[model samples]
Target: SPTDAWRYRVTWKALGRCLLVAPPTTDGELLDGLTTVLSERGASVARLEVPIGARRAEVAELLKPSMESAGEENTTVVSLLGLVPSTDAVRTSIALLQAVSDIGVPAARVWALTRRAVAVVPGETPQDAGAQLWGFGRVAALELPDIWGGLIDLPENRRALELAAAVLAGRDGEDQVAVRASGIYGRRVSRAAAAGAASWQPSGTVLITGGMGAIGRRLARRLAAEGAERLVLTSRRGPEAPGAAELAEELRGHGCEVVHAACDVAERDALAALVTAYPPNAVFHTAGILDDAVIDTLSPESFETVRGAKVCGAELLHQLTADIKGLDAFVLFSSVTGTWGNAGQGAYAAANAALDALAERRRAAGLPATSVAWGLWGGGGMAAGAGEESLSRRGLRAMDPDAAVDALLGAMGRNDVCVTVVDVDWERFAPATNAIRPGRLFDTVPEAREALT
Candidate 1:
């Protein structure tokens, strides 16, 4: 029963000169509780309220007064945006980090406070919008380490004392943390114990949504080669998608049946009909669209545009396929942007994170699900087209497609709910990412530690 897992551990330690930031309409009771706790801890606390939906420039303008008063000392700016779970809150977090990066003192670190933004324990609901902030915050840690602190998820009931202690805990090296009734826990990623042998074999019809895309085609070929008798490739344009014909012919040449359909998986009726006609024993949900934009400029519409294919499409598939009796595998193609974070990929990250959460939810209900958050794939996918130098500078190295596929096979055969398959050059990644700052998220990861040290 070995499975790739996310582990959390107990950790501790303070408030110095603290600034509490939140939207003007945030619940006063929560703010009051946090202020009271921090004040009782022998720390000076202040409040700064601003609109969460304002323009980035206007947000910066609002932050001016606080920036002027900030001195070079031990100060932490805590964003109290735990209550609300909406995309507008994502914009607010972006503005806060950007403004702090542009104008705030270098010594001041910004920590994002969220309520139920993450599921530290099994069966806990991670708010989708709040999860987006976690996605955005991690990228902020990588992109703006000088001014970024970390993220903390608290419980719903008032635990102001725990909240105050979390911020005051100083540099225990942990940044991504959550508070529960038991105690404080920090996030850590490690290797899962190896499962016995993969007993998986392709059977019945295998369906790949967005099968016309680069990664999808690569996956389709692998499945066809592995003795799959029938394959269904779906996309919005189907065979009309550029190079789709050749890809289908190539797969067909391998002695497997290929059916190409122009279907939008997000449309419930269309997807339902497709499922009825071609009930698949195995499903790979790889349909996603990238609408990359920096946090400051990202709009709600753009966020939904990307989420439509990635999140909505997967949801529809899960719903329509719920009664397939023995659906062998429900694999979702997620990005490391969701598992970790990538600058300018906020919307994509948000959608992917939702996909990961969905997989977790399905598994909790005793269903088949595995979400693979992949790193950059070489020779295919969108990131492959970006300059290698530009990508490497951002701590990304392209993963070999063949090798990545091998990892995929291993994952699909296991019961793990979510696994991040990425080839990271820690030596370079550490310096380029949050390692340059005071972060302990990677302390348990020796490869990262060796590089950081």
Candidate 2:
């Protein structure tokens, strides 16, 4: 339901932008094909040639001057006609547009077109593409029917281009305006639509803590793609991270409304002000710390350090947003270790368990609370500290970070009570248990005590 509402809003907003298309291939035939499509769609074409082996800087320079002029002339549509097989081309185009933003060029004026429909491999589909793009600090994928079709569908292209323009122009269409309006007629229509759709459309802002962290950054990107009208990304380092800035530009490029703020979630006054200032539709509490201490050796200070994030920080957020009427959900991140305590993770386990209890309390109080007991995985944040060999030895199956995110999103869509424990190989554990003859406690209490001793 959230996804549907997001799609409707995104479609409407994308219809307001200026459309620029960059082809991601160097093949002449592909270029010719795209040219034909654009010609039929009545879209204007700009030809800037890049030689084989041209670097990013060269490509940016070649296109920058022309893109600048086109933007200055209020040209709302741009199409690229070359073979670009690498992600660099796409990144370069985005970077170039951003570089010239001060010169009256906003990112919404640009779009990239791939040579063909990127093939759908067994594990890779359009959803995968969307996830991958989000992981790479992008908000959405155009996913043209055929690479050339995107160039030829002039009306559709114009719609997409205009939506971005509207975002830049700070204009909301009839549907969005109507949803925001609170008069009797507006409320009646909004309620009717909600009843029919089985979910209310998102109106309040989304505030992402740790907005510069890997997971935080990806989450922000996903929300932006889903057409969240306003965003507040808070981090200690501010909005200067290249990754954060890139994501912001991408959101803008796709015509999503957004803003960035610098605040520490651990600070009560700061968080209070943040919640007061941007009453959010959702809060993703992703700021966390990882510290491992064997049970016998664990210190109170170490325990406090872990608890501060999972327990204290989460509780603080709950307190800050308890009265915000527009809040839809509070997603708290936990770990698998909380469910099944580990040898050297006593602190982490205790903190996670405490946080889980806190979420239960919040849910009972009528807040939509979700605790995601995440598994050991790779990509971004402290996960970078985990070595490949260590991960393999733990019987853990690593996933593409983006794929893992999609899995989480699917779980959220279902609104299930328990999302995920961890991804582990049961067969590996079975063999160890059998060889060690670990006693079955419930079936043989005496034997189990003897074996444990």
Alpha-carbon lDDT, every model: 0.73, 0.47
lDDT of prediction 2: 0.47
Residue 291 of model 1, lDDT score: 53
The local lDDT score (0 to 100) that residue 445 gets in candidate 2 is: 21
**Per-residue C-alpha lDDT of model 1 across residues 151-263, encoded as one tens digit per residue:** 88777745645554555555575678777776677776655445446536677789899898878899899889888888999999977988888888899887889998887
Off by over 4 Å in 1: 1-17, 23-26, 48-58, 61-75, 99-107, 157-160, 253-255, 263-265, 290-302, 380-397, 431-435
Report RMSD (Å) for each prediction in the order shown: 4.2, 26.8
Q: In model 2, what is the error at residue 237, expressed in angstroms?
A: 1.8
Question: What would you estimate as the lDDT of candidate 1?
Answer: 0.73
TM-scores for every predicted model? 0.84, 0.50
Query: How high a TM-score does candidate 1 get?
Result: 0.84
- Candidate 2 per-residue lDDT, tens place, 384-453, comes to 3322233345455655566556655654554533344345454453333323222121112222233333
